Ligand binder design. Structure first.
Ligand SMILES: *Cc1c(COP(=O)(O)O)cnc(C)c1O
Ligand SMILES: *Cc1c(COP(=O)(O)O)cnc(C)c1O
Lengths: 392, 145, 398, 137
């Protein structure tokens, strides 16, 4: 049984932070992460803290495997974030395989990290990006895929969950349609891994990407999960130490995956700290924590909908609440709210095509996490009423 | 003497005008309210006119700043902002630099009028990305002449 | 003057026993870096602060000054010539892929020193295979340094890129970089300088040396893991293709295509390793109060005390160059892996193996080496400890 | 061909190792031990699974009709060579079932060798152990 006050207590930033409603950009960190990091950079030169950090590090891929229900720790590849993970799939798996005229299907809801790499590899190979539009509930229209898929369709790129609408498409169906056409699927899990971590075996996901910093964890660290046969098929990514087996002026041979894909000194601090994040988080029932965050988002959305000119872009009672007010620019509101003590985000959220689809050039977004409270909702509503008085 | 993307700042709206408006204001909220009012005197810049100014981008808000030298040998600045608060800050800035020579602009301390009007430390918008970029672009422009 | 005890006292990892002699693999961290990291992870990164006002400002100030502090270390002309990467390895791959790859023709040549770390060799083999170009070996002279005077013989009209280490991670040796650059620029070539060790010990003045690209890693420079730098001349960063695609590096995107920011941002897709940039900034700010010429003289003086004593043990062989603070060595008939393990048991942390420099160790005639590397937090006591531990290990491996 | 499991047994090792309490004696005695693992010639290093780690190690096997497994191998480093001798004493002549049945590293626990085994995890022993598991499958 989830206790919000127990979860909330682990977050040292909270007293200074005031009201923090921008977890969807980046999450606050629990003591476990701060302390694992402190310990790693302080570690006695040349045995009990030492061994604890060693077990955190060596167990780290396995803790990711357990989050995702990956078959084994060797399907987990360390990257610097979702962004590098997707570029790796595009460059190392897609680019050697794509032929001129092949098609890559990309949802209009995609964050730029799951869209720009595809534009780029399309331009390199003569493949074409084909748009997967939204249905009437603002989700990628998975039901339309059979009509969009052709004998040229090779890759489907689809967000598990939008960082704007919080909306999740019907990914099981989408993947079943893509696999039926012999396509591979790049799932962007940067939000989903935080809220509804994907069962990569049940969903039959080919590749899944997420970032540590959004999962209560360090910056500069992320994951690429891929099926072992796809990781084996991928070409090497960066060249250098660690990924290589033998090297001479005539050429080189590589380790197999995941090491093949990981040149140079790892982000050891980032691995250790994401290990601590995951170990800490595993003591909480994620369904229960997420229902709490969603219930606050709902309380905020119902209150704000009582104010004139409110519109919400929120899907599926998400813990993310994107919204705007008629005749008020999102910049002005975000500024006043910050002066009032409320931290949220405004602008395009790296999703310019989605926002163009919805007919807006920016929105405000308040995103709730399991350390947010009912008073945080009261404070946000109070600041919005004071801001709207100044702006309308 | 008409100028491209004409505005009143530095001609009909002066540092003196602004001091009179702003000096009595001690509450931060009223300062934002008056910035919002002041920015209403900056004319909207149509899409077609924006593309002859530099886009000084940022996450939350688009701001444009462009410049030229007038027939009197003085610099003319013009621009726009989508957010109304930053539009008011832009008007303050235009008030400080309009009709100055490159030399006079290199002589002036960045954002000095904002400290004069009680805007800089007191409002976080004054210390934000949007306004610091704007300030840098003036410097860049004064050098480039 | 440099005070070693002052420098040493700033490292929490050295408060309790242990002799650490593996700084060429990774450096210990000063309190400033540990505390900056702790603060960054303990405070909101948003725009609201209700209790830690000054501590939030200082984090913002470290982040905002970070490029400038790197520009200051390298004497770069401005902070927009500094690009954040994961490490030296990513930095070098970016230059191979974003500068070289679109410009290389079949039969073109890339000269790579035989003393290069894998980071500065493998990406060149990869891009050569992708473009039909060829990697050409720059051999060692008498002194075990890249033979810069051989360049006029190796340079042809097809020569495009020189990849050369400012400082070897095995020998500690530094080739005559100014002279290699003058020869390379005479032929219109561009030079990739791997400064992962040189940035620590002899940080390069990239203007005086006219370096085209320079790479190093934060973690060897007393800083965070997961962060590195690529310096490039502004014209070359501008010529480069974008590197990874995604947020921050784009300007406009639709389903019809995208435009990008100019450099450095063009080359930095997605959320930065903000903890790494802040921690590196704090490392550089902290290190700036020390005279590096003096701290390095200190570190090399210790490596000389160690090498002098070790050379009195039978079967000793040193690969050390130019009295470097790096001391790579072996003992006839003793395996380097047996020695490192026993030394670890005696409380000396050193490194054994191939040091990501297979071609170098093949030119040297060996399969692996021990390596003791010294830093300004090391002491004379460290030297007596290493030497004694070698003696005890030798009695066991007799 | 090697003595381990035949001429040298868990019992003979216990008489050597169980009495030792000083870590240096343990290492001294490991290094002694590996002297007695013959040097694998080039011809049958070919017939083994090669592992490059700091240290190079080899591990090969044959299975009798019976399913009794004969293991061979080698180590550049002498301390891993020693640990390899213990390991070979634990596993030589075992069947795939007896191998999956035992904990292969009981023997190290039994001889007071866990810290030495621990110290050399990274350069051969992890890998040697895993190629033991894989051969039984
Ligand atoms: C360490 C090192 C590198 C690699 O740096 P990483 O941080 O692993 O990317 C490259 N070159 C030399 C000389 C090095 O010492
Ligand atoms: C944040 C985010 C990303 C990008 O992650 P980075 O850590 O910046 O690389 C990609 N997709 C979604 C949906 C995101 O929210």
């Amino acid at each position: 049984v989830f206790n919000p006050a127990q979860f909330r207590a682990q977050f040292p930033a909270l007293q200074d932070a005031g009201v923090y409603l921008d977890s969807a950009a980046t999450a606050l960190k629990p003591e476990a992460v701060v302390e694992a990091t402190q310990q790693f950079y302080s570690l006695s030169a040349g045995f009990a803290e030492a061994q604890r950090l060693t077990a955190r590090y060596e167990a780290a891929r396995e803790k990711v495997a357990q989050l995702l229900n990956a078959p084994d720790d060797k399907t987990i590849v360390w990257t610097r974030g979702t962004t590098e993970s997707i570029n790796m799939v595009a460059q190392c798996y897609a680019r050697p395989r794509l032929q001129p005229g092949d098609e890559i299907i990309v949802s209009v809801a995609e964050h730029h990290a799951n869209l720009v790499p595809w534009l780029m590899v399309a331009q390199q190979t003569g493949a074409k990006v084909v748009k997967l539009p939204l249905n009437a509930q603002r989700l990628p229209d998975v039901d339309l895929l059979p009509e969009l898929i052709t004998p040229r369709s090779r890759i489907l790129a689809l967000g598990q969950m939008s960082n704007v609408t919080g909306g999740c498409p019907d990914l099981a169906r989408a993947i079943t349609f893509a696999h039926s056409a012999g396509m591979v699927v790049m799932v962007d899990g940067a939000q989903g891994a935080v809220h509804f971590p994907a069962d990569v075996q049940q969903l039959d996901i080919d590749f899944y990407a997420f970032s540590g910093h959004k999962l209560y964890g360090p910056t500069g660290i992320g994951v690429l999960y891929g099926k072992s046969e796809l990781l084996e098929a991928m070409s090497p990514w960066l060249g250098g130490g660690k990924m290589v087996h033998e090297v001479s002026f005539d050429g080189f041979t590589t380790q197999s995956a995941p090491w093949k894909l990981e040149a140079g000194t790892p982000n050891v601090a980032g691995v250790i700290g994401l290990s601590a994040a995951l170990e800490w988080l595993a003591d909480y029932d994620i369904n229960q924590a997420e229902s709490w965050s969603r219930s606050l988002a709902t309380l905020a959305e119902d209150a704000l909908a009582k104010r004139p000119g409110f519109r919400s872009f929120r899907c599926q009672d998400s813990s993310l609440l994107a919204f705007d007010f008629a005749g008020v620019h999102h910049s002005d509101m975000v500024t006043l709210l910050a002066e009032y003590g409320i931290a949220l985000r405004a602008g395009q959220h790296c999703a310019q095509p989605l926002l163009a689809e919805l007919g807006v050039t920016g929105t405000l977004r308040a995103s709730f996490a399991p350390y947010n409270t009912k008073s945080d909702v009261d404070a946000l509503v109070n600041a919005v009423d004071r801001a709207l008085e100044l702006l309308v | 003497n008409p100028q491209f993307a004409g505005h009143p700042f530095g001609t009909t709206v002066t540092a003196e005008t602004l001091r009179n408006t702003f000096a009595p204001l001690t509450q931060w909220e009223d300062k934002y309210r008056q910035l919002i009012m002041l920015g209403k005197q900056l004319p909207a810049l149509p899409d077609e006119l924006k593309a002859q100014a530099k886009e000084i981008a940022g996450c939350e808000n688009r701001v444009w700043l462009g410049y030229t030298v007038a027939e009197n040998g003085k610099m003319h600045f013009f621009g726009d902002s989508e957010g109304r608060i930053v539009r008011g800050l832009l008007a303050v800035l235009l008030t400080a630099v309009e009709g100055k020579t490159a030399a006079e602009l290199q002589a002036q301390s960045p954002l000095a009028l904002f400290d004069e009007l009680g805007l800089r430390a007191q409002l976080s918008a004054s210390r934000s990305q949007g306004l610091n970029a704007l300030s840098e672009a003036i410097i860049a422009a004064a050098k480039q002449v």
